Amino acid sequence: GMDLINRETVHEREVQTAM
Amino acid sequence: DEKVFTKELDQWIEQLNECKQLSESQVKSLCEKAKEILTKESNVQEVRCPVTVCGDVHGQFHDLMELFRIGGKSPDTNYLFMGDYVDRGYYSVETVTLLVALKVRYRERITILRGNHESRQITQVYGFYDECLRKYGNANVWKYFTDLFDYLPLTALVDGQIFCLHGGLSPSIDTLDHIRALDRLQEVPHEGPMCDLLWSDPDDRGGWGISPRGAGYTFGQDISETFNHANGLTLVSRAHQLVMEGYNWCHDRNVVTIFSAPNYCYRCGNQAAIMELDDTLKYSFLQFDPAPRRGEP
Amino acid sequence: GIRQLSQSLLPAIVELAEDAKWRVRLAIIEYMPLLAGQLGVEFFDEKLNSLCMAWLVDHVYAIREAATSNLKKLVEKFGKEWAHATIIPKVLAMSGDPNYLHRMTTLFCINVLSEVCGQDITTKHMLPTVLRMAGDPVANVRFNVAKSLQKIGPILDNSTLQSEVKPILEKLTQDQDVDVKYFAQEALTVLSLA
Ligand SMILES: [Fe+3]
Ligand SMILES: [Zn+2]
Numbered sequence: 486g487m488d489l490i491n492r493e494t495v496h497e498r499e500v501q502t503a504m
Numbered sequence: 505d506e507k508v509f510t511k512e513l514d515q516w517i518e519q520l521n522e523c524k525q526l527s528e529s530q531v532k533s534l535c536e537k538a539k540e541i542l543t544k545e546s547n548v549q550e551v552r553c554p555v556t557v558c559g560d561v562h563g564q565f566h567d568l569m570e571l572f573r574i575g576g577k578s579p580d581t582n583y584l585f586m587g588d589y590v591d592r593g594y595y596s597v598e599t600v601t602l603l604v605a606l607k608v609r610y611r612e613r614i615t616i617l618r619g620n621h622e623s624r625q626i627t628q629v630y631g632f633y634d635e636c637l638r639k640y641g642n643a644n645v646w647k648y649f650t651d652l653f654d655y656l657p658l659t660a661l662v663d664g665q666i667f668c669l670h671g672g673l674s675p676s677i678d679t680l681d682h683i684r685a686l687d688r689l690q691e692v693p694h695e696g697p698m699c700d701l702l703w704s705d706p707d708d709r710g711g712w713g714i715s716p717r718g719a720g721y722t723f724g725q726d727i728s729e730t731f732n733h734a735n736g737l738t739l740v741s742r743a744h745q746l747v748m749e750g751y752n753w754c755h756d757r758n759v760v761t762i763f764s765a766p767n768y769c770y771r772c773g774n775q776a777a778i779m780e781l782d783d784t785l786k787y788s789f790l791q792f793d794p795a796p797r798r799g800e801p
Numbered sequence: 802g803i804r805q806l807s808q809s810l811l812p813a814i815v816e817l818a819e820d821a822k823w824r825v826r827l828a829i830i831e832y833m834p835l836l837a838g839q840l841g842v843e844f845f846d847e848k849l850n851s852l853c854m855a856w857l858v859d860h861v862y863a864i865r866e867a868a869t870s871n872l873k874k875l876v877e878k879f880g881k882e883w884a885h886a887t888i889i890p891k892v893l894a895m896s897g898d899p900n901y902l903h904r905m906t907t908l909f910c911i912n913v914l915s916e917v918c919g920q921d922i923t924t925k926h927m928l929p930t931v932l933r934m935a936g937d938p939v940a941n942v943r944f945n946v947a948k949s950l951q952k953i954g955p956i957l958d959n960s961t962l963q964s965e966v967k968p969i970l971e972k973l974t975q976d977q978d979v980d981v982k983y984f985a986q987e988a989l990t991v992l993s994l995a
Pocket of ligand 1: 560588619620
């Protein structure tokens with residue numbers, strides 16, 4: 486399924502984008 | 505006197521080893537004394553060999569117990585944890601309390617650095633805030649620890665040759681003296697040096713690059729070679745990135761990543777590793793698998 | 802007769818003792834005193850003694866811990882004389898190991914061996930090593946020496962405590978490292994030397 490690392494990286498960016 | 509507290513602190517450690525949380529009052533007292541110790545420590549903590557270096561543990565308390573079984577119990581074994589003690593694990597409260605408890609008891613034997621998850625913002629998203637509220641009924645304990653996180657050193661330097669930090673290098677940092685100049689007693693910024701030191705990643709791409717995490721930067725081999733030579737470093741010891749084999753050399757062995765949470769998030773199935781630095785500073789790596797969970801097939 | 806099985810048992814024991822999974826190595830260690838008792842002293846010395854010593858230097862601490870207690874159970878069966886001739890001279894050799902984890906293992910071994918080897922063997926052969934290590938450049942070794950003396954001190958004669966143990970502990974209290982001072986003080990208090 487979804488790659489392990491990419492799953493966490495995307496949401497980390499979302500949090501950082503929300504700031 | 506100090507003797508009575510020392511025995512009390514010893515009791516806490518044994519209690520915490522059994523995975524039993526301390527009371528809110530006890531946590532408050534522990535945090536207060538922790539700050540007094542941490543406030544005296546530099547942004548680049550001078551660490552002596554021999555020492556065992558550990559990556560993220562993310563509240564996986566029972567694998568932290570495995571870590572001690574492999575590497576030996578404190579204070580007999582000197583330890584250097586590179587951050588990320590909470591979130592993404594059922595036992596962040598016990599995990600962080602034990603490591604803070606050991607630091608207060610054995611300040612000289614254990615070093616705990618700040619990771620990107622040692623943050624008020626991040627802990628409110630990835631579970632540490634929820635766990636504290638669930639395990640205590642109010643956010644005071646979360647308030648205490650997050651305040652304590654501000655005092656954790658950003659980086660450590662082992663025998664002046666191996667440089668340890670969570671995230672990685674920064675465009676704003678060229679010399680360790682630049683790190684020593686930062687003001688760390690604050691919530692983790694979204695930009696600048698203190699952000700990069702906790703969020704950056706090594707990369708195959710040359711030079712600086714845009715971080716996919718939305719924070720920090722990716723740096724290529726040329727960056728690491730320049731930084732090591734400029735500062736007389738042999739190695740950059742690093743955390744903050746899941747690696748399946750537990751440790752991963754990169755950039756022609758200028759950088760090594762160490763990840764110490766086995767079967768990350770209970771689903772990755774990765775191996776964990778810890779790097780033991782000999783009395784001669786010669787490095788060695790121990791790989792270990794998740795501890796057999798009692799009553800859980 | 803188990804002697805007939807010995808030739809077939811040893812290859813299996815060797816493979817288990819050297820298994821990749823440390824928890825497998827742990828399991829065989831727990832049966833070593835049982836196997837050693839059945840196979841006898843002579844077979845153990847020729848075939849199994851090397852395996853036991855190899856465990857003491859294992860990378861995994863848990864294995865070293867288990868092997869340390871394995872020595873006590875073996876000595877409880879084969880007696881003091883066998884331990885002095887076979888085990889003690891080899892464990893003390895680790896004192897010179899360049900790795901502080903392995904050097905500390907010697908202190909751990911002495912901690913459990915003194916419980917069985919008795920006063921005479923402890924004073925003449927094991928105690929001198931402990932006192933020598935008090936000067937180890939690594940603080941972890943030095944305050945383990947303090948802890949070791951605290952545990953084996955009661956087994957020593959009073960004349961030995963006042964003559965040799967007391968001055969060494971007093972020196973450790975002056976050590977720069979906080980932990981060495983603390984445990985040195987505790988050792989003196991427990992032993993009632995100061
Ligand atoms: Fe991280
Ligand atoms: Zn992490």
